[PDB]
Write a protein that binds this ligand. Structure first.
Ligand SMILES: Oc1ccc(/C=C/c2cc(O)cc(O)c2)cc1
Lengths: 267, 268
C-alpha cells in the first residue's frame, strides 16, 4: 500500500538525517553551490596542506614534513580514520532500518562487513565534484589535482573515485533518495556466508519497492532513473574490488615496525 | 503508450529466434531428460570422450590425447571455435536492434567487442544445469566433473560459469525475456572508447522500459525481478575478468597453441 512506502521512506529519511552529520543538501551548499558565507579552507598545494590542519581539527597527524613519514602516507591514514567513523554512523543507520535487528546477529555482522564499503563510496560522491572532495566535516576541500600529484602508489587511489562520483552525481539524487538507495545496498543477500537469506531479501524487496515510488514521485521527468541507479551499483562492486588491489600493494610497502601494534589492530 | 514497448518486445524476440539455432526452450527440452525427442551423449571420462567422436560430431582427435594435443587442448580449441561462431550470431542479432546500425561505425564495433562475452555467458547458462552443459548444437553433453578435473591451467575455467548459471537460472527467465535483456547489454553507454553515448543511452533508456513491462506481464508474481535481473550484470562482468586473465596464463604455458584471429580483436 502506497501509504506504507511513503511512511517507510519518511522513516528512513528522518533516520538518515539523524545518523549522518554532513548531509548532501548541506555539502551541496558548502561546495560549488553558493551559500557563500562560511566557505571551506582549500588545500591545493603541498604548502596548502602544509600546516594546513591549522584550522581544521584533525585527529592523528599535524603539519610535519622533512623526511619524517611521507605526506602521501599521512593523507591516506586520514581517510581510514574517517572510514572507521562512517562505519559507526552506518552501523547505527542499519539498526534504524525496519527489521534489520530482528535478524540473526551473525547475519547483521556479515551484511555490514561487506556493505560498509559500497555505502562509503556512495556517500563520498556527496562530498565530491569534478574539482575536489569535501573534508573534515566540511571545513575542508582537498583539490583533485593535489590528490593526483601524490606518491607513486597513492596516485590512482582516489582517481577511480572521482570518476564514479562524477557519473553518480549526474543522476542528481538527494538525501531522501540516497536514504533508501543505501538501505537496499546493506540488505543485499548475495553476501558470502549469510545463513538465512529469505528474511534479508524480503526487506530489500520492500526497500526496492519504496525506492521506486520515491524516484517516481521525486523525479517525475527522469525517465528510467530507478534502472540506471541499480546499474551504478555494479560500478560500486567493481570500484571496491579494485580498491583492495592498490591496497594490497600497500601491505607490501610499509610494515616491520614495532611502534604500530595497537594501531594496526584498530584498522 | 505501453503499445510500442510491446511491439518492440515482439520485434526483438523474433530476431533472437532467427539468430540463435539453439534457444533456451530447445535447450531445456533436451536437458530435462524427459523429452526423449532427442537425447544427448554424455561425456564424463576418457573412454566416453573417445566414443563421442563417433556418436557426435567431433572432427577432433580420437586416440592419444597428451602426446598429440592432449585432451585438455582438444576441448579448448573446440570451445574456441564455438565462440567465434557465437560472436557472429550475436553480430547478426545486434544489427536487428533498432538504431544500432545507424550509430557511428566505430561505436558499433566498440559495442560488439565488449558486448560479446557478456552475452555469451548469459546464453551459455541456457545450456547448463547443476551438472553440465550441452555442446554441438545439443548433440552432446559434457559433465561438470569431467571438466573440473583437467590439466592444471584448463582445469578451472568453466567453474565460474556453472556457478553463474545456477544462481542466474534461478530467476527462471525464458527466451522472449533474454531477448530484451540481451539488447540492453549491447546498447550500454558506459563502455570504454565510445564516441557518442547520448544516442546510445537513448536506445537503452527505452529497451529498459521494454524489459520492465515485459517482466511485469510475463512474471506477474516474481516481484523486483526487473531490479534483480539488472543486478545480474555485475556477476557477469566479473566472469570476463577471471577469463581474460586466466587466458593470459595459458598464452604463456602453451606457446605452441594458437588462438582464433577474431577472438583476439576483442580482449583488452
Ligand atoms: O575432442 C573434443 C571434441 C569436441 C569438443 C567440443 C567442445 C564443445 C564445447 C562447447 O561449450 C560447445 C560446443 O558446441 C563444443 C571437445 C573435445
Amino acid at each position: 500500500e502506497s501509504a506504507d512506502l511513503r511512511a517507510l521512506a519518511k522513516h528512513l529519511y528522518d533516520s538518515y538525517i539523524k545518523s549522518f552529520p554532513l548531509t548532501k543538501a548541506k555539502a551541496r551548499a558548502i561546495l560549488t553551490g553558493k551559500t557563500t558565507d562560511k566557505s571551506p579552507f582549500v588545500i591545493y598545494d603541498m604548502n596548502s596542506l602544509m600546516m594546513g590542519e591549522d584550522k581544521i581539527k584533525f585527529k592523528h597527524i599535524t603539519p610535519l614534513q622533512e623526511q619524517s613519514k611521507e605526506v602521501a602516507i599521512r593523507i591516506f591514514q586520514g581517510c581510514q580514520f574517517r572510514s572507521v567513523e562512517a562505519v559507526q554512523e552506518i552501523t547505527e543507520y542499519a539498526k534504524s532500518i525496519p527489521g534489520f535487528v530482528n535478524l540473526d546477529l551473525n547475519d547483521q555482522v556479515t551484511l555490514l562487513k561487506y556493505g560498509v564499503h559500497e555505502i562509503i563510496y556512495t556517500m563520498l560522491a556527496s562530498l565530491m565534484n569534478k574539482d575536489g572532495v569535501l573534508i573534515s566535516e566540511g571545513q575542508g576541500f582537498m583539490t583533485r589535482e593535489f590528490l593526483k600529484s601524490l606518491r607513486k602508489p597513492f596516485g590512482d587511489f582516489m582517481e577511480p573515485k572521482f570518476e564514479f562520483a562524477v557519473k553518480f552525481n549526474a543522476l542528481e539524487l538527494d538525501d531522501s533518495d540516497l536514504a533508501i538507495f543505501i538501505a537496499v545496498i546493506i540488505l543485499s543477500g548475495d553476501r558470502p556466508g549469510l545463513l538465512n537469506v529469505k528474511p534479508i531479501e524480503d526487506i530489500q524487496d520492500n526497500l526496492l519497492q519504496a525506492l521506486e515510488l520515491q524516484l517516481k514521485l521525486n523525479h517525475p521527468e527522469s525517465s528510467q532513473l530507478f534502472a540506471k541507479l541499480l546499474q551504478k551499483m555494479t560500478d560500486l562492486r567493481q570500484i571496491v574490488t579494485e580498491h583492495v588491489q592498490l591496497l594490497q600493494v600497500i601491505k607490501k610497502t610499509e610494515t616491520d615496525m614495532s611502534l604500530h601494534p595497537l594501531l594496526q589492530e584498530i584498522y
